[PDB]
Structure 1
Amino acid sequence: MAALTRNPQFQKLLEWHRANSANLKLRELFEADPERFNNFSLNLNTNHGHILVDYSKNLVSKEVMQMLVELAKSRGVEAARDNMFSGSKINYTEDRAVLHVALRNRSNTPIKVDGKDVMPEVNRVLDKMKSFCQRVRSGDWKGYTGKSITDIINIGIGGSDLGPLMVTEALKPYSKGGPRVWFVSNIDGTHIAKTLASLSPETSLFIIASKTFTTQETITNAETAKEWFLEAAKDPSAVAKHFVALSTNTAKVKEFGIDPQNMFEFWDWVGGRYSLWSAIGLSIALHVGFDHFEQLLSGAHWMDQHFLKTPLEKNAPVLLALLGIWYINCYGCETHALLPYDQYMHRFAAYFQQGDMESNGKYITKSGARVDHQTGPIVWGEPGTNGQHAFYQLIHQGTKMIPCDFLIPVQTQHPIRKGLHHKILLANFLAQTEALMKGKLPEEARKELQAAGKSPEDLEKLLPHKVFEGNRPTNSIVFTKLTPFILGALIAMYEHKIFVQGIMWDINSFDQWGVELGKQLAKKIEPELEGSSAVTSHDSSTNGLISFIKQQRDTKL
C-alpha cells in the first residue's frame, strides 16, 4: 500500500467512518451541544483584524477531530513543517528548498539554504521593487516620448499570472494613484490583441514574468508586444523604457532589449504557484503601492507564524487540511468549492485551482510507490450570491457531497445605500450554510404547500421535490475587512492547508512533472500544422483533427 493507508491512525479513522459516519447529522450535533460553535471555531486576532474560521457545520465530533489531529502528528506534519521553514530541501524530486515563507519573512530571522542566509537577497530585490515603484508611480519614469506611464501590462503564464491578477483584483480599492494594470496570459492571440488595442505605446510599460526568460507562450506574447511597440517607437534603444523582466536570465533579458538593472530576481525555492510574494508580485506593488505590498507580505508572515507556533488542534491551516482529508479519503468527495461572497475576490477560486491542484494533483509517494488512495481535490467556485442562481441547485438537491468554504469580509469596501447591499450579502452568506446544514423537512414543506392552496393530489406529487435533505457541511471564513494584510493572511492559510495535505498523502506538493508530456507533444505538432501536406504521424484522432484544421482554415464565412 502507501504511507497513508498503512498508517494505524488512518486505519482507525477509516474504520470509525465506516461504522459511525452514517449517524452523523449536523442538525443533531448542534442540538446536543450548545457549545458546538465555541468548540469548533477559531477566532484569530492578527492585531490587524480578526479571521474567524468557523468549522462547526462539519460532519465531525470531538472524537473525529482528535483522530484527525493524531493522524497529522503520526504523518510527520510537525517535523515536515519545521523542515520547510528551516530551508531543508523538501522538494525531493527536484532537490530544492521550499521557501515562499522566506519571501515574506518580515522578522528577518536568518533562513539558510546551503549554509547561506537568503534574507539579504530577498530584501535586496524588495528594495529594488520599491525603488522601481517610486519611479513609475511618481511619473518620474518616462516613456519614449517623455510621458509618465499610465498602464502596466504583466505578461506571464500560470504562477506568473494568476497571483498578480487575483491580488490586484481583490485589492482594487487600494490602487489610488497607481497605474492601470492589465494581464496577458493566454497564447491565444486574442488576449494580447485586445489588450494592445486599448493602449498607447507612449505610456505603456510591460512586465515580462519568466524565470528562464525562454517560456514559450510568455516570450511569444512579449515579442508580439515588442513588435507593436517598435512600430510606433522605431528605436530599439526605446525598449528599455517600456519593458522590464522578472527573471534571472541576464543574457536573454539583455538580448530582448531590457536594461539588466530592471531584472527583478527570484530563486529556485520559489515555486511559480507560490511566487506572488516575490519579484513576481511587482505588478501588485505598482498597482497598490509598495506599502500595501508590504502589508500583504506581513499578513502572510502572520499566518506563517500562526502555522509554525500553534498546537495542531487549534491551528487554522492544519484544521482546514484535516477536514479536507476527512472528506476526500473517508467520504470520497472529488471536489472542494471556494465561494467568496465578494466580487473583488472573483479570481480567488481560479488562483487556488493552480495552488491546490497543481500542488496536490499527484500519485507518486516519497518512496516512489503509487498511492492507493485519493489525493488533491478538484477546486472550483464562483462568488456569492451569483452562484446561488447558477449551481447551488445541485449543491442543495443533487447527488454529490461537496465540501464548501464560504468566505466574506464583515466590512465592505463600498457601503452604498447605508450598508443595504452588504446587509443583504451577509444575510445570504449566513443563510446558505444554515440551509445546507438544516435542509427542510417533509412536515415543513407540506405546510407550505397546503398554505399555497395546492390540491391534495398536487401536494402529494410536489412534496418530495420541495424537501431539502440538508446535512451538507461547510466552513465559514469571516474576516474584519479584505485589506492587503488580511488577504495575505488568507492566501498563506490556504498555502499551508495544501502543504499539510501533501505531507499526509506523502506526495510532493512542490514539483509539477505532470506538465511535461503535453509540452513535448505540442512541440512535435507545431511544425506539422504549416502547409497543406497530410499529417499521419499520430493516432487517427490527432491526425483527423489536424486534417479538419487544414481543410477548414481557408473557408470563407
Structure 2
Amino acid sequence: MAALTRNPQFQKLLEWHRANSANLKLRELFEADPERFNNFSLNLNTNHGHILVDYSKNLVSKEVMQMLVELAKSRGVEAARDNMFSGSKINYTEDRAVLHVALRNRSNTPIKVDGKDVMPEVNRVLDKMKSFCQRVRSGDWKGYTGKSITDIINIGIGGSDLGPLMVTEALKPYSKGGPRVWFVSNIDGTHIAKTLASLSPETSLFIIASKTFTTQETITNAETAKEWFLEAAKDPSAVAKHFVALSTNTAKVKEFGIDPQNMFEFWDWVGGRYSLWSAIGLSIALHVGFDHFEQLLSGAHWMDQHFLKTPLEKNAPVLLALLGIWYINCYGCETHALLPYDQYMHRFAAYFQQGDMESNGKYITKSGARVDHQTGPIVWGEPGTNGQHAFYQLIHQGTKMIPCDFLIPVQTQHPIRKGLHHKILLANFLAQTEALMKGKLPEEARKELQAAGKSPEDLEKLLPHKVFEGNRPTNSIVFTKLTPFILGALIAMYEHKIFVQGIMWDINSFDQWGVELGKQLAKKIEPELEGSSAVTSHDSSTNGLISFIKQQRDTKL
C-alpha cells in the first residue's frame, strides 16, 4: 500500500468517518454551539489588511480537527516544510530544490542550494526588472523608429502565462501609467493573429516567457511575432529594442536571437506553476509598476512566514489542506470549486487549475508505490454572482458533494452608486454559503407553498422540488481589499495548501512527467498531416480523424 493508507492516524480518521460522519449536521451544529464561528475560524492580521479564513461551515467537529492535525504531524508536514524552506532538494524525481519562497524572501536571510546563497541572484534579477520597468514605463525606452512603448505582449504558455495573466487582471486598478498588456499563449494562430492585428511593430514590446525556452507553442509564437516585426523593421539589430526573454536557458535564448542583456533569468528550483514571483512576473511589474510587484512579493512573504512559524492547529494553509484531505480521502469528493466574488479575479480558478492539478494530479509516491487512494481534485469555478445563474443549481440540488471556497474583498475598487453594487455582491456571497449550509426542510417548503395559495394538489406536486437538503460545506475567505499585498498572501496561501496535501499523499507536487507522452505523439503526427496520402500508422481512430482532416481541409465555406 501507500504511506497515507498505511498511516494509523489516517485509518483512525477513516474509521471515525465511517461510524460518525452521517451524524454531522451543520444546521444543528450551529444551533447547539454559539461559539462555532469563533472556534473554527482564523482572523489573520497582516498589518496590511486582514484575511478571515472562516472554515466553520465545514462538516467537522473539534474531534475531527484534532485527528486531522494529528495526521499532519504523523505525515511529517513540519519537517517537509522546513526542508523546502532550507533549499533541500525535495523535488526528488528531478533532484531539484523547490524555492519559490526564495523569490519573495524580503528578509534576505540566506537560503542555500549546493552550499551557495540564492538571494544575491534573486535580488540581482529583481533590480534588473526594476530598472527595465522604469525605462519602459517612463517612456524613455524607445522602439526602432524612436517612439515610446505602448503595448507589452507576453508570449508563453502554462506557468509562463497563467500567473501574469491572472495577476494583471486582478490588479487592473493599479495599472494607470503602465503600458497595455496582452497575453498570447495558444498555438492556435487565432491567438497571435488577433493580437498582432491591433498592434504596431514600432510601439510593441514582446516578452518571450519560457522556463525551458523550447516549448513548441511559445517558440513558434515567438518566431511568428519576430517575422511580423522584421517584415516592418527590416533590421535584425532592431530586435533588441522589442524582444526580451524570461528563461533559465541562456543558450536557447541566444539561439533565438535575443540580446544577453535582454534576458531576465530564473532558476531550475522555480517551478513554472510557481513562477510569477520570479522574472516571469515582468509583465506584472511593467503593467502595475515595480513598487506594486514588490508589494505582491511582500504579501507572499507574509504568508510564507505564517506557514513557517504558526502551530498547525492555527495555520491557514495547513487547515485548508486538511479540510481538503477530509473531503477527498474520506468523503470521496472529486472536485474543489473556487468561487471569488470579484470580477477582477475571473482568472483565479484557471490559475489554480495548473497550480493544484499539475502539482497533485499524481499517482506514484516517494516510496515508489502506486497510490491506493485519491490524490489531487479537479479544480473549477467562475466568479460570483455569475456562477449563481449558471451552475449553483447543481451545487444546491444535484447529487454531488462539492467543497467550495467563497472569496471576497470587503472593500471594492469601484464603489459606484454609493456602494450599492458591492452591498448586493456581499449579500449574495453571504447568503449562498448560508443557503448551502442550512437548506430548506420539507415542512419549511410546505409552509411557503401554503402561503402562496397553492391547492393541496399543486402543493403536493411541487413540494419535493422545493426542498433543499443542505449540509453542503463551504469555506469563506474574506479580506479587507484586493491589493497587491493581499493578493500575494492569498496566492501563497493556496500554494502552501497544495504543498501540504502533496506531503500527506507522499507524492511529488513539483514535477510534471505526465505531459511528456502527448508532446512525443504530437511530434510524430505533425509531418503526417502534409500531403493527401492516407495515414495507416496509428490506431483506426487516429487514422480516421487524420483522413477526415485531409478530406475536409479544401472544402469552401
Bin the TM-score by the shorter chain: over 0.9
Deviation sequence 1:503-551 (CA, Å, 0-9, x none): 0000000000000111110010001000011101100000000000000
8 Å Cα contact 1:296-1:486 kept in structure 2? yes
Deviation sequence 1:173-198 (CA, Å, 0-9, x none): 00010000000000000000000011
Q: Secondary structure at the match of 1:51?
A: strand
Structure-to-structure mapping, 1:118-517, within 5 angstroms: 118-517=118-517
Structure 1 position 455, deviation (Å): 1.1
8 Å Cα contact 2:160-2:211 kept in structure 1? no
Deviation sequence 1:232-263 (CA, Å, 0-9, x none): 11111111110000013333323333211010
Q: Secondary structure at the match of 1:5?
A: helix
The CA distance in 2 between the partners of 1:256 and 1:232, in whole Å, is: 19
Deviation sequence 1:481-503 (CA, Å, 0-9, x none): 00000000000000000000000
8 Å Cα contact 1:299-1:484 kept in structure 2? yes
The CA distance in 1 between the partners of 2:248 and 2:430, in whole Å, is: 47
Q: Which moved more, 1:299-308 or 1:207-216?
A: 207-216
Q: Secondary structure at the match of 2:371?
A: coil
Deviation sequence 1:132-151 (CA, Å, 0-9, x none): 00010000000011000000
8 Å Cα contact 1:155-1:161 kept in structure 2? yes
Structure 1 position 269, deviation (Å): 0.2
Q: Secondary structure at the match of 2:3?
A: coil
Q: Secondary structure at the match of 2:383?
A: coil
The CA distance in 1 between the partners of 2:250 and 2:51, in whole Å, is: 42
The CA distance in 2 between the partners of 1:389 and 1:126, in whole Å, is: 43
The CA distance in 2 between the partners of 1:213 and 1:442, in whole Å, is: 60
Structure 1 position 448, deviation (Å): 1.3
Q: Secondary structure at the match of 1:364?
A: coil
The CA distance in 2 between the partners of 1:476 and 1:468, in whole Å, is: 20
Q: Secondary structure at the match of 1:405?
A: strand
Structure 1 position 231, deviation (Å): 1.1
The CA distance in 2 between the partners of 1:349 and 1:367, in whole Å, is: 32
Tell me whether 1:113 sits opposite 2:113 in the alignment: yes
The CA distance in 2 between the partners of 1:249 and 1:10, in whole Å, is: 43
The CA distance in 1 between the partners of 2:325 and 2:249, in whole Å, is: 40
Q: Tell me how many residue pairs correspond in the alignment.
A: 557
Q: Secondary structure at the match of 1:148?
A: coil
Q: Which moved more, 1:243-252 or 1:14-23?
A: 243-252
The CA distance in 2 between the partners of 1:528 and 1:244, in whole Å, is: 34
TM-score (norm 1): 1.00
State, as a whole percentage, how many aligned pairs show the same letter: 100
Any gaps of 5 or more consecutive residues in structure 2?
none
Deviation sequence 1:110-141 (CA, Å, 0-9, x none): 00000000000000000000000001000000
8 Å Cα contact 2:248-2:268 kept in structure 1? no
Structure 1 position 213, deviation (Å): 1.9
Structure 1 position 32, deviation (Å): 1.1
8 Å Cα contact 1:237-1:257 kept in structure 2? no
The CA distance in 1 between the partners of 2:211 and 2:43, in whole Å, is: 39
Structure 1 position 215, deviation (Å): 1.5
8 Å Cα contact 2:247-2:265 kept in structure 1? yes
Tell me whether 1:30 sits opposite 2:24 in the alignment: no
Structure 1 position 212, deviation (Å): 2.6
8 Å Cα contact 2:211-2:272 kept in structure 1? no
Q: Secondary structure at the match of 1:448?
A: helix
Q: Which moved more, 1:349-358 or 1:453-462?
A: 453-462
The CA distance in 2 between the partners of 1:255 and 1:34, in whole Å, is: 66
Q: Secondary structure at the match of 1:4?
A: helix
TM-score (norm 2): 1.00
8 Å Cα contact 1:248-1:263 kept in structure 2? no
Q: Secondary structure at the match of 2:47?
A: coil
Q: Which moved more, 1:182-191 or 1:437-446?
A: 437-446
CA RMSD after TM alignment = 0.6
8 Å Cα contact 1:532-1:550 kept in structure 2? yes
Structure-to-structure mapping, 1:509-528, within 5 angstroms: 509-528=509-528
Structure 1 position 24, deviation (Å): 0.2
Structure-to-structure mapping, 1:534-549, within 5 angstroms: 534-549=534-549
Any gaps of 5 or more consecutive residues in structure 1?
none
Structure 1 position 264, deviation (Å): 0.3
Deviation sequence 1:388-410 (CA, Å, 0-9, x none): 00000000000000000000000
The CA distance in 2 between the partners of 1:325 and 1:212, in whole Å, is: 33
Q: Secondary structure at the match of 1:42?
A: strand
The CA distance in 2 between the partners of 1:361 and 1:283, in whole Å, is: 29
Structure 1 position 437, deviation (Å): 0.2
Structure 1 position 211, deviation (Å): 2.3
8 Å Cα contact 2:212-2:247 kept in structure 1? yes
Deviation sequence 1:339-376 (CA, Å, 0-9, x none): 00000000000000000000000000001110000000
Deviation sequence 1:416-475 (CA, Å, 0-9, x none): 000000000000000000000000111211111112221110100100000100000000
8 Å Cα contact 2:187-2:217 kept in structure 1? yes
8 Å Cα contact 1:338-1:349 kept in structure 2? yes
